[PDB]
Design an enzyme around this catalytic site. Sequence first.
Site, PDB file in Angstrom:
ATOM      1  N   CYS A   1      42.915  45.974  35.045  1.00  0.00           N
ATOM      2  CA  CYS A   1      43.192  44.593  35.430  1.00  0.00           C
ATOM      3  C   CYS A   1      44.264  44.507  36.507  1.00  0.00           C
ATOM      4  CB  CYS A   1      43.588  43.755  34.214  1.00  0.00           C
ATOM      5  SG  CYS A   1      44.739  44.525  33.076  1.00  0.00           S
TER       6      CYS A   1
ATOM      7  N   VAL B   1      43.577  42.153  39.737  1.00  0.00           N
ATOM      8  CA  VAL B   1      44.416  41.009  40.080  1.00  0.00           C
ATOM      9  C   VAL B   1      44.900  41.106  41.524  1.00  0.00           C
ATOM     10  CG1 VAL B   1      46.521  39.767  39.519  1.00  0.00           C
ATOM     11  CG2 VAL B   1      45.054  40.574  37.696  1.00  0.00           C
TER      12      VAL B   1
END
Lengths: 522, 522, 477, 477
Positions: free
Chosen positions: A152, A156
């Site tokens: 992640c 992001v």
Amino acid sequence: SQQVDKIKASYPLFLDQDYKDMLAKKRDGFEEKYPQDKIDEVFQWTTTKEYQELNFQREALTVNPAKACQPLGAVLCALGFEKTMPYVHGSQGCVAYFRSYFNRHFREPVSCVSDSMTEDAAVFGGQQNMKDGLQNCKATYKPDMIAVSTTCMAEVIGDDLNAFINNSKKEGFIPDEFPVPFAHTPSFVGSHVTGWDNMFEGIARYFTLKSMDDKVVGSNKKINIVPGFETYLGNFRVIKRMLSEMGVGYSLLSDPEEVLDTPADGQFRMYAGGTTQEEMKDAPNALNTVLLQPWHLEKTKKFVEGTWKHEVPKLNIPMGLDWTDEFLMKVSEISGQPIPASLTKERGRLVDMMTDSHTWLHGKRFALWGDPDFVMGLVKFLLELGCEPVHILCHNGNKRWKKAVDAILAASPYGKNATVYIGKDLWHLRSLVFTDKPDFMIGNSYGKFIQRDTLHKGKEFEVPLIRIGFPIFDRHHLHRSTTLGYEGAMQILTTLVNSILERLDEETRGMQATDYNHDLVR
Amino acid sequence: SQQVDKIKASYPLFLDQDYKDMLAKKRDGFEEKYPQDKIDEVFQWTTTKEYQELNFQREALTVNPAKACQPLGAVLCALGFEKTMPYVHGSQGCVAYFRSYFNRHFREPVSCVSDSMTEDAAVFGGQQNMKDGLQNCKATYKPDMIAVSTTCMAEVIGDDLNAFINNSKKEGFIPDEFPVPFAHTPSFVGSHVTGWDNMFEGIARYFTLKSMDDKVVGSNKKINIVPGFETYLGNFRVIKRMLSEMGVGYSLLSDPEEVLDTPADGQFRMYAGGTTQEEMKDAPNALNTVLLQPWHLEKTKKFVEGTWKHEVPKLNIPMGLDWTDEFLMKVSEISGQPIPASLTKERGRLVDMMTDSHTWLHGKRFALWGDPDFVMGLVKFLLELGCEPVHILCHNGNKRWKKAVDAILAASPYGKNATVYIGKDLWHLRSLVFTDKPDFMIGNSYGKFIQRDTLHKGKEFEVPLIRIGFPIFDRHHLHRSTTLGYEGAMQILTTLVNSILERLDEETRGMQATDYNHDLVR
Amino acid sequence: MSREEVESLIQEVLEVYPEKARKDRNKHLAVNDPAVTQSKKCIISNKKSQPGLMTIRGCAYAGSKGVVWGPIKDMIHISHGPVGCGQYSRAGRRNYYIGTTGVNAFVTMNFTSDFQEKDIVFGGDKKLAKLIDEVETLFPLNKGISVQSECPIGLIGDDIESVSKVKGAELSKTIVPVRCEGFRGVSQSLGHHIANDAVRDWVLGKRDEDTTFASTPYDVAIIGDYNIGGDAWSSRILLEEMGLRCVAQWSGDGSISEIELTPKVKLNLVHCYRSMNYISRHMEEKYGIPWMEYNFFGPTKTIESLRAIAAKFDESIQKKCEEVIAKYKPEWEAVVAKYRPRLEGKRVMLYIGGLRPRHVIGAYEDLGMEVVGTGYEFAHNDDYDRTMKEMGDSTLLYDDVTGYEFEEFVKRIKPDLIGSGIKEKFIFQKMGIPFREMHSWDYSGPYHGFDGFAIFARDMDMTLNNPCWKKLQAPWE
Amino acid sequence: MSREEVESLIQEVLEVYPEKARKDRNKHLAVNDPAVTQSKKCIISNKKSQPGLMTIRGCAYAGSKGVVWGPIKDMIHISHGPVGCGQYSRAGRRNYYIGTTGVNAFVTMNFTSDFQEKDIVFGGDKKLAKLIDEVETLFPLNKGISVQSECPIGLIGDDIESVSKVKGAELSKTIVPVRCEGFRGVSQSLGHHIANDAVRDWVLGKRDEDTTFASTPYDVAIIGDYNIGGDAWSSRILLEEMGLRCVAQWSGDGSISEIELTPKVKLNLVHCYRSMNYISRHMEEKYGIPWMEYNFFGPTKTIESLRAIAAKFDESIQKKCEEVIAKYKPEWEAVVAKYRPRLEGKRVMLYIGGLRPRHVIGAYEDLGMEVVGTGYEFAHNDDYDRTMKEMGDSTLLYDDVTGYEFEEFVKRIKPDLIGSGIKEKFIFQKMGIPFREMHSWDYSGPYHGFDGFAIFARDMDMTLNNPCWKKLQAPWE
Ligand code: ICS
Ligand code: ICS
Ligand SMILES: [Fe+3]
Ligand SMILES: [Fe+3]
């Protein structure tokens, strides 16, 4: 103290009187613990309908989820290809966790690498990490292919995997011919099964998108099989065996069964088995593609139908009697191979076991959870056994899947007391099994804490756990089992009926109290 | 009373207050029951070492035996031949019992007939019974062969089976060419395994004794396999699979796996599968004969070596790692077929499973019972796992077998606390597991009453039962399991380690008392 | 032996790497010399991992949530972010505790905000506030809340500190924000540091004005024992037998009141220097509490430790210490007599996180065993300073070892036993080398103290001498 | 249905037999006419079985040890002979009891002399005497011993009567010799008769001179209920609710004191006429106790039985009977309302032992079900006399049916459900026809009484309407 001839581990060592007294002193003196009466009252309250109403009003808090993040599925998919290194673009802690999770489920080594992005990459991206990591991985572990997923952190900050890999190839970090399929696997979307789907679609696209010109559907006389996120080795094995018995040419795409079951013969085999690159390149030439777990193979389905032009059959997961029948019949229709007498006999043997055990199975109430395809297959088989699913939970299910399960339930009288929950976790399920008590739970090792809680209410309220699913951490070698096909149905039937009988034996064991029913013959 | 929506069977129906009060009234008013304090005192006494001394001084009283009579084994052997009707010369009650016993173990139809000798045959013999019974059986059930055994009635009156059958043939009750092998199976000698041995020797003699002139050892390039009394279908299956993987031609003599596993497809198949008469006639032409359970195949060994002139290898039962290795190597030497890579990999996978659960298996103490070959194979595998056999019981064992097991035990440090008992029953074993408590029992369904008794002493004294062996009446479909070869070893290892972990989970489930050790990961 | 042989092995292993990776990894591998007490001149540590090389290191969140904060039993720890991190770390570490789980203890539960795409795009502070309200409703007996940030929290600019302050003031509850995003640092070590800072800032000083706790000259706190398999309990019993009063126990079986009471003790007993040195030094500066390292691994170390601790108090404690030593002497002597002959001469290699690779060596030497190699995932250079003098001459040292490196080293050295974590276990079991888990004690233990030593010795014997290891070669191969 | 069709079927089935077997078996198959009262003129029964035909019958040892004597909980029953008989019959029959097994109850244990060759050659009386001494030492709380002879005992010249007399006089214990050798008779029924004779000769009259037991006008005994699945308890509760005092029940959950107390009751309630008519008639002759048959299978039979039994007593008992009927009416009405629509119209065939083939028809008719065929292993002609008026016109009757015969009859009639024993169950399940065990209640029950009726209805529904029966045909064939 210890006795050298009978050494005690933590249990029962800490039940010794000196340890009990010391722990009581610690609690009384320094823990400022709530009084035991308050603890009992709050626990009793957590078992109530009012508490359940509060619990099901949750909107922001998740407690004890029954799913994981996408890159775990991506890593499992990558593991199914020959001499392939799963490579997770992002932070190394994720890879430590993925490896430990799979180690504990499979009790086998799990190979996976990270490019160890840090705060510097948070400021300037992870392109350099990708270049150096690809070079290091290829040089050190000598894979035939590197399959790239993402954590992640990378998602992001918006790391362009395609640009990074292409730049690595042009700048000479890895050869231009070296296959590096990639997939974006954002953990804040879907779950581990979604990550498997994304990784598989990435690999299939990488090998087939640009070479479709010379591809002719059906020219290799095979059927492609896509198993999805599968953590029972018996499932891969049973699909291969069943197709071999029919004389059906097939290509299992993402087959990790060899690399997760290497022998202990004095050497460490980092790679073994797995789908070959030639199989992936030749897949569009197959007669058709069958998806074993369609409810998390949607993106793969879109690619296979749109690009390979395969008319992917509308088939459920081959679990139970009816769905195994339908799978075999569709395979027969696609390949023109008749269903052989061995499979007919195996089906008849499963039916024989059903007739032998129906009296103990009938009317039993179950709470169950897991991934969507596994859950719906288990629900269908339970309805075939005359059992009553009551609490059906799928944390990573969706509305369309829920409607399909509701239609399955409405087709049988045994589904009348069933409710399907999506987006609910194991704390919700704890409340459910308190307020509408089933006979058993079917789920993964995380259900043992629910069994603990129900026992704490009282022996009459305890709901035993039947471990089927993923992960199973507190039993050994259950990952070798089978849940698909007639063989899997047989194994599940045996497990269920013998769990029932084991509970009955336990309840009737008391001499001169309940052992009038402690029958020798059941 | 009953509630229509939740109907209760005997358990827990008779725990209702009205039933409890009625039973208390019955006991107090009319049963003249010993006071509860006396009952508790006598039970406690039955758990003592002094009681064990008295119990082991038994010479005439047998309590809860762990064996059956010969004709049961004879019937099981006869069932393994194609379209063969087991025929028991003697009283019909024996056949009712044999059929029900096997029905309850296998959950499958069991075909067997008697000639219903009555008081009249006690003075005139059973010759007329034999003639009419052979004619009736052949006319009605249309068998290709009738295999004749005897009950103890026929043995005591000395019925000449040979003369009776020959006279039946001469007088036209059955055709002279119709095969009717016979064997004397006196129930006051040996046990069910002895009956299997006698029946098999009778069949082999009937088919081969008079036609040895044209027989040439090794001419058919096969190895004969004699399984003995076997009640796990997986065992027949695994032997066949292992020999097929090696490319070894073989002939399984007495194969009942098909007739004990017919499918439920709308018709009743009285016969299925089984060794053909042509295989039995051609058996002397094989390279050699392997006996899978030598310790009850002695008479068969004498006939095979003396008449067929086969050099029967000295092999243990193929149970556990080392004995499976030795069996495969001997088969390789006899047939000239190398051991293939698939079997090497399977062996490595079993070793892998061993190396993983060794920490939970090590030092665990077991009491076990069963037939001699099964018991010694289990003892050998337990020593391979680092487990400690403590009480080894074989009711139908002999001194030579006991010496062999003692030699096995002395070869390992893990055998230091083991004692082998022969001629002892399950009441003896009950005393043993009270006075020298093991961790678990491995045995058949008759051990559940011992577990009940040990629990009655207290939860800390309870010895859980692990059901391996014959008969298993209180669990479903365990007759499908495997105990031979690497696959059987794997199944047994899984069963053992997961029984250990299940007990541990049970002991650590108590909230805030013992659940500090209720680990998610084991 | 043969220092030159080991250095050559280091070079031969290194040859496969690309140039930059090889140059980096060369600094992290060294041959030991006990006279060398300045490890920086010899080995380098606490640096970034080389990408793509299969390191064993975890992340800050593991060091903070998994290690320091998670064991605190009466608090609720929120895994703030997407679902993976809390799930993989749920109950994976055996930090034992006494409590009623889900009612007044929460260690083995997984509380998370389960971030979705909308939480990534629009932020998660409002979700966090609602989550805290829901926690208060559903778990009223909780005694505080910690927020353990996963990677996206730091990446999306969420302000969990302001949410924690506002909600804590609103509900009169201690809410501890922890910025332990996994991309920070290079391992679990910065996780330790961040967690210790959170303890110092939000919990440790809540009772600075409170003087109602009664104190004694024998008040101690156990700092940096996480009670793996009950280790901290097995140590606490020895301390209490010596006449000391263990006021606080960080953080295994720990409670928030114990942390708050720690500033009132007379001496801090630090087991894991690596993870809790930050708070120990802070406590010395702010409250004047002295601290000392101790070692309860095996009879020699535990006897030395008990005597050194008792020396910090008056004569009565010293007499009690000698009595404890005398009372336990026959037990560990019997253990040695039974198990040393089975293990004498056997050689062990280790690779663990930040303390145990040097702390267990004395226990191994008490059974006549030699540690021919040891290393750390995330130790610092002071850790190697402490390590060098305890390891034998010309033994191998490896910092942040790669999977390939450790496999090659083991293939050459061929130790009789390897002690490491779950990601190496089955690798070396398949190579036919006995393996003990040195993080979780292979679901066994405790190993600390006299009672732990018997379990340690039995475990090492049962694994090292197990018959399975003699069966890896098929008789026809 | 269609009488001529049924006799056609009988002839076609019979054609396969040889002439002697065919002529014999012809007498044992009849088409029912309820007008006929003397069943001898149509069907023959209680004859020897045809050799080689796969009968379902047992032996006399089963009828005596398995049926009559075995359930007596506080006695020890010795299986005298070789090992097989006691082992196959150990705990095979669900005659439920309350006790502490191995201490003061012994029903599910297997005591045997385990005859060897030497016992066959040199006799077994001395082994029997030593065995009895061993029993006394090892099971001191036993209240009597029975010796159940297996086939060799009668065949060899053993005299267990004198051993029993001598030992019983020596130890002041009741030792009951039973000559139930399996070759005697033709089925379990002579076993019943032999066992009843043993009860009469050695147990029943021990208290003929004792007058210390207090009696009431409402004293009854339940004779011939063996408490399968608790049937006798479920009946006893109704009897005691009616205001009667059940002094004894024979022999399920029975004790030797209850047997000895039976001669003091006012009325004998006979459930199984076939097995206990001998002792009931003896008791009427010698003690003047009247007896009556009753039926607690299903609400109609239960209500009729309760009313008749109450009619045997004063007005207060009759009022109590009406109260019991009123109290239970809603329960069986709810059962009927829920389960009759699911079973209405379904057709059943039965084959059981001596009583249940006719005794259970009322319950099936209470669920709107029809019995299109029934038969017995070992019934006598009086049993068929009752059965014919119980059964409907043109229904099939079979005595001592062979496996082939019953299979052919079922293949033609095609009932919706078959009720029989364990040796037929799996045959007809493979044939795709629902099957209920009517001996053991398929390890379910009780079925007697109002509480038993609900279990009966649930069981019949769950088996008859089970989804498994719709899946025997693979979709591709
Ligand atoms: S805290 Fe550290 S990795 Fe000091 S993060 Fe790690 S329970 Fe290790 S060597 Mo797992 S610095 Fe503790 C540790 Fe040591 S989790 Fe445990 S064993 S003594
Ligand atoms: S005793 Fe008889 S065969 Fe009357 S031998 Fe048999 S427990 Fe049957 S029809 Mo099994 S004359 Fe009882 C009987 Fe009926 S064992 Fe039970 S069910 S009512
Ligand atoms: Fe493994
Ligand atoms: Fe079956």
